[PDB]
Every structure is written in C-alpha cells, then in structure tokens.
Amino acid sequence: PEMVRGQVFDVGPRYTNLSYIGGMVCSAYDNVNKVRVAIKKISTYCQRTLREIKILLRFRHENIIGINDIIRAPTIEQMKDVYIVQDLMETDLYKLLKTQHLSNDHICYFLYQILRGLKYIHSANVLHRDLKPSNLLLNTTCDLKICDFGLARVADPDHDHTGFLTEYVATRWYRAPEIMLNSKGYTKSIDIWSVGCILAEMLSNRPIFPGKHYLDQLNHILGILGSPSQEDLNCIINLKARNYLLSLPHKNKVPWNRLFPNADSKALDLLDKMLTFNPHKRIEVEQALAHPYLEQYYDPSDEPIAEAPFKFDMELDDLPKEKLKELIFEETARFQP
C-alpha cells in the first residue's frame, strides 16, 4: 500500500500516483476512467460520516459533489479506514478568495450555482448547515459544487426554538444571528444567511462578520445591520435573548454601498434580503434565484428539485459505536466488486 506524508493511503490498484491536497485528502489517478480523482480517508466512527454518505449517495445534482466510489475492507471485522472517491476539483472558494479578485460576472455565476444547488438540497427537506467558502469546490472552468454534508439535518421548524446562548457546532462566521438568540438552526433560513455571508465575502475578499467568539459573532452582525426593529425584537419571545438585545446601545445600519463601494447595485439588493435579521422575513432560495441580479441565469425549468424528501430512518444521535460501523458498512456495500 502507498503512503503519503507518513500516512498509509491504501486505495487498491485502481487509484495510483498519490499527491496530498488537505483524515487526509489526496488526488490520485483513476486507472479505470483515466482521470485524476479526489479521495478522502476517514479513520471509533462518527455520525457525520454516515450522515454525509447517505445524503450524497441519494443526491444527484450538477452543483452538489457526488460520490463516485467508496473503498473499504470486505468485512466489518477488517474495515478500519473508509475512502470516499469524488470528482477532482482544482480549488475551492476559500483558496480562490485568499488569492484572486472576482469579477462581478464570476460573483454572479458563483452565486447562481450556490443557489441552484441549494434549491435542490432544500427541496429534499435537507439543511446543509455549514455553507462557507471552503465547502464550495471549483474546477478550472469555474463549475461549482457544494460539498461537506457532515452537519446536514432534515428540516424541523416546529422544534427550532431554544434559549439564549445555546452552543452550536457549525462554523462561527457564517452563523445567522438567531443561532445566538433562540434558534437550533433547524430551518432553511439558516442556509440563506450563510449564502449572504459568502456573497459579501466574494464582494470584498474578506469575511463580513469575523467574530472571535460565540457572542462576538452577534456583535459583528449588529454592527452592520444595526439595532433590530421593535417588530423584529417582539418576535424574540425568550426574555434572556430579548433583554440582551434591549441592553445594547443603539447601532446604526451601515449602508451596503459604503461597505461595498465597487459592488453591483442589484447584488447589494439581494445581499440585503439574504442578510435580514429576522429569519421569517429572510428571502428563500427560490425567490433569491428569481432576483434581478441573477436574471441572466435564472431558468426554473433548469433548476431541478429532488424526486422526494430525504429521511433518516432512525435517530442517529443515540447510536452506539457498533451499530454505526455496521450502518457505514451497509451504506457502502454497493461499491464492492
């Protein structure tokens, strides 16, 4: 078996000539299809691995990363590592934003593809819950694919409510304000906020709300949106959350065209609607696609939806380590000779 940087990366004779990318991700030559592919090693096991495999095997969409192959040992007893084989993608939006200025045409096209993929995910009653530039892969022709469904959940708006300062798992800079106030992130509006943040970041190459800790994230958001309105406050019924907001000095709204003096005015209109404080008033993915900014691309007949809502059969949260390994083994069975 081949090794890469002091790690065994043992991907049978099908995949050869391994180079590191970023458990470990390597590129490799697929000797069957005769293209370089991406392979990630997962090494007891995690709910997130299973969640992702079930979702990505069920999903089929041009703006969502697929799984092409999964490599594992023939038996549960011998299975330790799982390798997931996917299309090689030259770069991601995080790497691209660190090094490149995007034209308005590129920002428009990337945003379109993000929302087109998101329309499909949401149509399956799934929330991604960790959209950020590093989860948006790109190839040399700027095709974009959404990846990393390890924190994805079936939508559950009736159980979205929680108390103030409830701990959350997803990446801090892309968290909607309501996460810090009264939300478990179980509604589609959570993903739109992330997309808003990403749009802002494409406009200036810098994260819009780079909070350094849990409540600082909310301070950054309010520093630009300004103080919530009485009506938006009245929607927050939780008294700890409400009174925290009432305790803050008045903050004026920073005009988008002053933060983003170079941006297209239609892009800023859409940004505003995605970065709305009140999640009920926030634009939905299909409205976003229909927005004038995206007129050159918008075509709902060519923005497919999922054939059915996605379902986890049992609650993965209480699963002992043994049943989880067995579930991963079973979900990966179709790729065995």
Ligand SMILES: *CCS(=O)(=O)Nc1ccnc2[nH]ccc12
């Ligand atoms: C989805 C982000 S990842 O880091 O999990 N996977 C990944 C990284 C780099 N290049 C890739 N090509 C396909 C999948 C990846």
